[PDB]
Amino acid sequence: GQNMRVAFMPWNGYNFEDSILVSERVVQEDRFTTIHIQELACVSRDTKL
Amino acid sequence: DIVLNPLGVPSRMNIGQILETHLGMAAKGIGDKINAMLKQQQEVAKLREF
Amino acid sequence: ARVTVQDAVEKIGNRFDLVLVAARRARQMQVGGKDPLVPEENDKTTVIALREIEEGLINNQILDVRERQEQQEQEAAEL
Amino acid sequence: EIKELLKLGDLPTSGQIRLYDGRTGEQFERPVTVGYMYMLKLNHLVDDKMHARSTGSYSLVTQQPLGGKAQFGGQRFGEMEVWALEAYGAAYTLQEMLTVKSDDVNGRTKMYKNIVDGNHQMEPGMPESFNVLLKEIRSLGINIELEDE
Amino acid sequence: EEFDAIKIALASPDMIRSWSFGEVKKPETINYRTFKPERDGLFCARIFGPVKDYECLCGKYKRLKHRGVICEKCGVEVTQTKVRRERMGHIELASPTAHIWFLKSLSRIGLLLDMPLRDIERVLYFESYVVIEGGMTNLERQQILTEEQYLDALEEFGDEFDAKMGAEAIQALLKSMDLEQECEQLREELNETNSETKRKKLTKRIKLLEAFVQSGNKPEWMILTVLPVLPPDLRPLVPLDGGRFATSDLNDLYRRVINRNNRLKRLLDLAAPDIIVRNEKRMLQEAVDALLDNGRRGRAITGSNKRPLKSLADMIKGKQGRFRQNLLGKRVDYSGRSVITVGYLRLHQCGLPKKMALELFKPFIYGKLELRGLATTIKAAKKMVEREEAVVWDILDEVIREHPVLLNRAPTLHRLGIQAFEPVLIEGKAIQLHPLVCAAYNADFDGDQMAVHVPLTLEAQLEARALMMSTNNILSPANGEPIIVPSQDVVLGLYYMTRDCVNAKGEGMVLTGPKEAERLYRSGLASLHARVKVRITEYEKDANGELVAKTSLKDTTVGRAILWMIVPKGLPYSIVNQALGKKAISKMLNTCYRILGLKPTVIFADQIMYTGFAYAARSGASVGIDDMVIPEKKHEIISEAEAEVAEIQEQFQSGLVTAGERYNKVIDIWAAANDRVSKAMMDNLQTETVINRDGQEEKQVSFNSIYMMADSGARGSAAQIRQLAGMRGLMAKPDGSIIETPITANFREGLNVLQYFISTHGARKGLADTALKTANSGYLTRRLVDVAQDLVVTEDDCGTHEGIMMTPVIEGGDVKEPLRDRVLGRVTAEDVLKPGTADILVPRNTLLHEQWCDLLEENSVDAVKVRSVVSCDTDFGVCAHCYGRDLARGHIINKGEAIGVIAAQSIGEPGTQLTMSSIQVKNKGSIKLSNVKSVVNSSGKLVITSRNTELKLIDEFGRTKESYKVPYGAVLAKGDGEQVAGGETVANWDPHTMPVITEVSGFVRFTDMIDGQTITRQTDELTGLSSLVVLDSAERTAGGKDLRPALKIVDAQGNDVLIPGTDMPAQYFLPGKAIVQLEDGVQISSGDTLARIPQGLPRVADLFEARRPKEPAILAEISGIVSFGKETKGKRRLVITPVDGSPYEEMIPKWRQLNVFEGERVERGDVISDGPEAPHDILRLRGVHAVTRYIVNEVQDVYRLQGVKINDKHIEVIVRQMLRKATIVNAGSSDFLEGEQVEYSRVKIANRELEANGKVGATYSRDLLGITKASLATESFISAASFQETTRVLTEAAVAGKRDELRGLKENVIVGRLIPAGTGYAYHQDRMRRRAAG
């Protein structure tokens, strides 16, 4: 994964029950951006019609 | 950039993360000194000593 | 009114009876186009009845009078 | 060793530092432990879990909505939450969970049409998951009827 | 369309033919080249209907030109394809075949025929003949016959007798037999011989024939001749996309039965030998059996995948059956799922993702879009929804509002698992939830998913707002304790604000209001924790609901003064002048609701959440490594603890000490070290703050972050900080024994490799049960809700007579549940009066709210009679006054609501959490004894000689404070009624020696004591003072075992000494292990002895199962003198001789200690044998009140041990349904001793004790049944059909021809009708008025 500055303190209840608060910086720096590759299939059969 | 709830530390009995956090700050402090002296280029030998 | 129904229960005396009277009113209030007797102030169909119960304008025995007089005068209209 | 490294790093030996708030810019009453920790991103993505079905696939033998997000099926309302509903006492909600939501061929179409016409009128009927049970029991050679009036 | 009931019976073959629209004779199903079904096949369109809507097979008639004509070219009626789901066909068999349900299940075909089950199978397999009719006297009806033995009958008689082979022989036997003759014959002869071992068998036969009497059900329909086939749409063979097919296994079974049925037809015209026709008929019988049930009678017939084929009986049986997976649990429409996340939101608000709302409310958007006129047609509506124009969001913001949406979290343990929430659109991806309701949902933001459900109809949108809204649910249904308590972060901020330090800032200043304290804190001029003087004006309602103000100056800190602008002008200021821990906040929220109301409480709770979050952020709390302090004495304590290990080890290697003593000593020293470390660790964590202010030095409370997080109760407890800092206790290996080597290190110092390997056992064992025992909890809750089906309130006050006793729980230890808590929510039974006589607070019916609770608390009352649910006399339900007030609402319960399911979830929710010589007085009080048999010992003190007496501690008020059981034959140091201070050993008795102390005094001579036949000559080797030894039956001579050795008390003349005041003899009989202490010739005094006789979750779950204990306690059913008859024949006998009545004798094990003797008297329902009490015997001997008191006192132990508080009314409601059966002992309207319902007994005596009859009815006996068995024992056949033993329930109901009145809750769930509870109850009153008025 990635490593970054980590604090330990409640923040207005946004980390109330195991919740995790992040920055706009990590999104801007694309630290946790990932790539997912899907595939699709178009079956073409010979129907009696 | 990331704030974690501290209440989940004692009750969950996971204190290795605190040591990991302190050691991470130590390593990043080393890095912040290293790049600081790298941007100034005091001496290669001085870097080799530090 | 809109957050709580605490004061609506005492006007009827039972929690379960709010729905069976408020929905009964709202049926005609929605499909029959009957004019509500309470200010609407940008509210839905299922909440103005509750706000009216919070005032207590209607009650189980007096829903069956304004509707029955209607068919009563229809009887004279028909014959 | 951590203390020696922090001394080498020109950092407080305690390991926590004083911070200012991003909103009002004041020092907090107590120093806050701040450092670096290896974060990870798990495979449980939020969009892989978000699903919603207003009216989609329907089962073959039971005529109920299908299951699974990939199949665009609806959520399963088990008997566990049925007990919660009947404990509350909201019978109309529970009735619509079993009649106009899943197993009324001639009921849910009307439920759609009248709400399209802005009429929240309930017109329930016999669940389709009970005709199957009656037919199966009758196929067992076990006569079963409904004693009407 | 509307019906009244559901009728279940057996299908006559004529009625099966009536249902059928054709006879299937061709086993083939569809063509292969074309894909149309064949004529008279398994999907024959003539029999079942067209494959496509309004289309015939060829095309002669179509397009609705011809409405319902039948195409003459093919024979197919034209109609909708829905008819294919309705139409059924039939299979015409050549040889009649036997149904498998009424043959293998238990017998229903064997009981009717009174034939052995094995012989029925032998006859079925074409192996043993049966004599249908014996024309001669040599043979007999229903005789087993072998082939060789049958040849003799053929050569002897031939046509005179009638004996053949096969299932049709059984059918002919059923045809020939007559049940009226059995009715008139068996009943008369049954009364002649009342053999109890066969009494139930004859009763069962009588019940079966009687049930056949009115069922109109001829048992000749037992043997199936025509078999119905399932509609093809329900056994579907559907083409797949890849040109493939797949079909239900039922189609394979139908093909299999048809294939051999037609073969059997072909074997008749071909004149097959009987040997092969038998084989074919066996093939057919096996095939039809497998069709009905695959793995029941023979090997489970599989397919090409060697997996057993699922028969149609399997389609309705078990968790995979329809009753559970398609009727009770259903997939739902207009619903979705997403992850959950924390919210700033208000308590009635929920964070919806803006993307899911348009999908869920899509029909609503379509409906309101045409009203807006923006889309002429629905197609354009859908098109612009797909484009997601800006207009749709403009419409959306009004569709969502004033429209609550249900939230769901799997699993739904209790009622609060589903709550309504007014949606709030969030431009995000996840669902935002209010933090304060997470505890009720048991949801943590660690990836948990929530289920969203939008209500459609007007009532549902109304029911959710009126009853399901989160603002309504503040108290738990289980108990009136609040459920919106702040969990972890709000309490931390509140604790930090409500803290005091003596050197912080701005100390001692006087201020004239809380508002200007807030500006001092915000400006930073004064610290948050600073003892100051503030002017506070609070409000009270001493008037008739009118608030009154009072202004005063209080000495407080700034943090608490800030809170006063948050309280809703209705609380004393002293409620916030503390540290305000978690329990303080809980009681604060309770107080706000109990004094002010609900809306003020909701607003206050929201503002507390906001303030707690804001000030927790303002403070800042972290977890520093320096915060985990380590005691300096850790190594010293470890060294001084292992020092004794060497001493223990050297003692063991010396041999003077044993291994068990070694283990005990080392574990004791390790426990002591653990306590020493725990104390030394907490010393440096609670008062570690050594700070001085205008002085020398002072010690205050700690400011360590861990110390606040533990003291405030936010997360963890002090029992965990020990593992943080001290050694982590001692771990036990999974066998049960605990390792003597403890984990001396903690997490801060790190652990050892061997230490970690030791500790992992506790981790695995702790989590393994959670991964396993939750299934047990789920099954228990499922069983509980079944017996809680029709438990709905029907009346307000049934006006029943007196009910249950009430008392505190002082037994055993101190007071745990006082009367202050156990009666809150009760209605009295009798006019309870204060200790001041003729002063009554109740007219036999009041609601015991807090005011009456305080009124009785101020008095010295200790016993109150309340109207219990068991005591309720309401039929088919309970009345409100017999239950008490609601717990979620606090008011008296109104009619309509259901209580059984509420209680079942109340007790079933915490189930997953609860998996695992001398008497000294403590306080000054009187020494009272209840039912004491007084006798004076040799030293002038008081001694006891009764087991049924218990010590009582009475204070100056009069109520019993403490109680301790004293056994029979103990020695006391003080008398009765002594007001002595605490710390006195009042009772002394040997833990093993059980004396036979004699109440009377006088000379003692050895009587009825002959040496060599019953006793042995033994003398002590040190003292010499000894006497003859009486051993048990297993050690004494059998010659003298006929008579029990009796030592009567004599005088100088030699006469029996009787009881003073009664003419009955007073002599003692010596059981085994009775060695006489004194010699012969010497005497004993009063109070002296003759001889010395030396001596989890399933735990609560098995009570509802009525599990018999392995070592039950035997009691007496009548009073009088107890005796013993037959000796040592399997088990001893116990003769009972009352004053007038009867030789009640039973098997009693002499191997277990007894309480009374031959010469002693015992009353009915008293402990004569020891061991755990059997609830069945408690019911049989003592009343239902005793057993329900036992159960409520028993099950409460586990929940008290786990700190879970449940209102006691949530147990006997189940117990009230456990006590539903009733066995009759009299007659007049029913059978001799058949089991009936208690309600049926009550209604049967509602016309014989009334004016309708003088006296003909019968008296009953209350019966108790297990939680599983009592669920089946209902007048409803469909309620139990959906829980367990579906095949058995169906086959039992079918032969009885039962009908269901649709009274239960799940009965209307299955049929889809309204649920007779609450709103459904008020709807059902109309239906009850309908059938009554014709």
From Swiss-Prot, chain B:
Uses in biotechnology: Co-administration of salinamide and rifampicin or salinamide and myxopyronin suppresses the emergence of resistance to both antibiotics.
Taxonomy, superkingdom: Bacteria
Entry PTM: Acetylated on several lysine residues in the presence of glucose.
Entry function: DNA-dependent RNA polymerase (RNAP) catalyzes the transcription of DNA into RNA using the four ribonucleoside triphosphates as substrates.
Subunit relationships: The RNAP catalytic core consists of 2 alpha, 1 beta, 1 beta' and 1 omega subunit. When a sigma factor is associated with the core the holoenzyme is formed, which can initiate transcription. The rRNA transcription and antitermination complex (rrnTAC) consists of RNAP, NusA, NusB, NusE (rpsJ), NusG, SubB, ribosomal protein S4, DNA and precursor rRNA; S4 is more flexible than other subunits. In pull-down experiments interacts with CedA.
Family affiliation: Belongs to the RNA polymerase beta chain family.
Name of the molecule in the record: DNA-directed RNA polymerase subunit beta
Gene: rpoB
Curated annotation (Swiss-Prot), chain C:
Example GO molecular function: DNA-directed RNA polymerase activity
Keyword Nucleotide-binding: no
One of the GO biological process terms: intracellular iron ion homeostasis
4Fe-4S is among the record's keywords: no
Role: Promotes RNA polymerase (RNAP) assembly. Latches the N- and C-terminal regions of the beta' subunit thereby facilitating its interaction with the beta and alpha subunits. Part of the processive rRNA transcription and antitermination complex (rrnTAC). The complex forms an RNA-chaperone ring around the RNA exit tunnel of RNAP. It supports rapid transcription and antitermination of rRNA operons, cotranscriptional rRNA folding, and annealing of distal rRNA regions to allow correct ribosome biogenesis.
Enzyme Commission no: 2.7.7.6
Encoding gene per record: rpoZ
Main enzyme class: transferase
Gene3D superfamilies in alphabetical order: 3.90.940.10
Catalytic activity line of the entry: RNA(n) + a ribonucleoside 5'-triphosphate = RNA(n+1) + diphosphate
Pfam families assigned to the protein according to its UniProt record, in alphabetical order: RNA_pol_Rpb6
Family: Belongs to the RNA polymerase subunit omega family.
InterPro entries (alphabetical): DNA-dir_RNA_pol_omega, Pol_omega/Rpo6/RPB6, RPB6/omega-like_sf
Keyword terms, alphabetized: DNA-directed RNA polymerase, Nucleotidyltransferase, Transcription, Transferase
Protein name: DNA-directed RNA polymerase subunit omega
Cross-referenced HAMAP family: RNApol_bact_RpoZ
Quaternary assembly: The RNAP catalytic core consists of 2 alpha, 1 beta, 1 beta' and 1 omega subunit. When a sigma factor is associated with the core the holoenzyme is formed, which can initiate transcription. The rRNA transcription and antitermination complex (rrnTAC) consists of RNAP, NusA, NusB, NusE (rpsJ), NusG, SubB, ribosomal protein S4, DNA and precursor rRNA; S4 is more flexible than other subunits.
One GO cellular component term: cytosolic DNA-directed RNA polymerase complex
UniProtKB/Swiss-Prot annotation, chain E:
Intrachain S-S bonds: none
Effect of residue 759 to A: Resistant to antibiotics salinamide A and B
InterPro entries reported in the protein's UniProt record: DNA-dir_RpoC_beta_prime, DNA-dir_RpoC_beta_prime_bact, RNA_pol_asu, RNA_pol_N, RNA_pol_Rpb1_1, RNA_pol_Rpb1_3, RNA_pol_Rpb1_3_sf, RNA_pol_Rpb1_4
Enzyme Commission no: 2.7.7.6
Protein's GO biological process: bacterial-type flagellum assembly; bacterial-type flagellum-dependent cell motility; cell motility; cellular response to cell envelope stress; DNA-templated transcription initiation; intracellular iron ion homeostasis; nitrate assimilation; regulation of DNA-templated transcription elongation
Record PTM: Acetylated on several lysine residues in the presence of glucose.
Reactions it catalyzes: RNA(n) + a ribonucleoside 5'-triphosphate = RNA(n+1) + diphosphate
SMART domains noted in UniProt: RPOLA_N (SM00663)
Effect of residue 766 to A/C: Resistant to antibiotics salinamide A and B
One Pfam assignment: RNA_pol_Rpb1_2
Annotated effect of mutating residue 722 to C/H/P/S: Resistant to antibiotics salinamide A and B
Chain positions found as N6-acetyllysine: 952
Binding positions for Zn(2+) 1 per the UniProt entry: 56, 58, 71, 74
Residues the record lists as binding Mg(2+): 444, 446, 448
Any one GO MF annotation of this record: DNA binding
Cited PANTHER family: DNA-DIRECTED RNA POLYMERASE (PTHR19376), DNA-DIRECTED RNA POLYMERASE SUBUNIT BETA (PTHR19376:SF54)
Similarity field: Belongs to the RNA polymerase beta' chain family.
Identification of the protein by name: DNA-directed RNA polymerase subunit beta'
Gene this chain is encoded by: rpoC
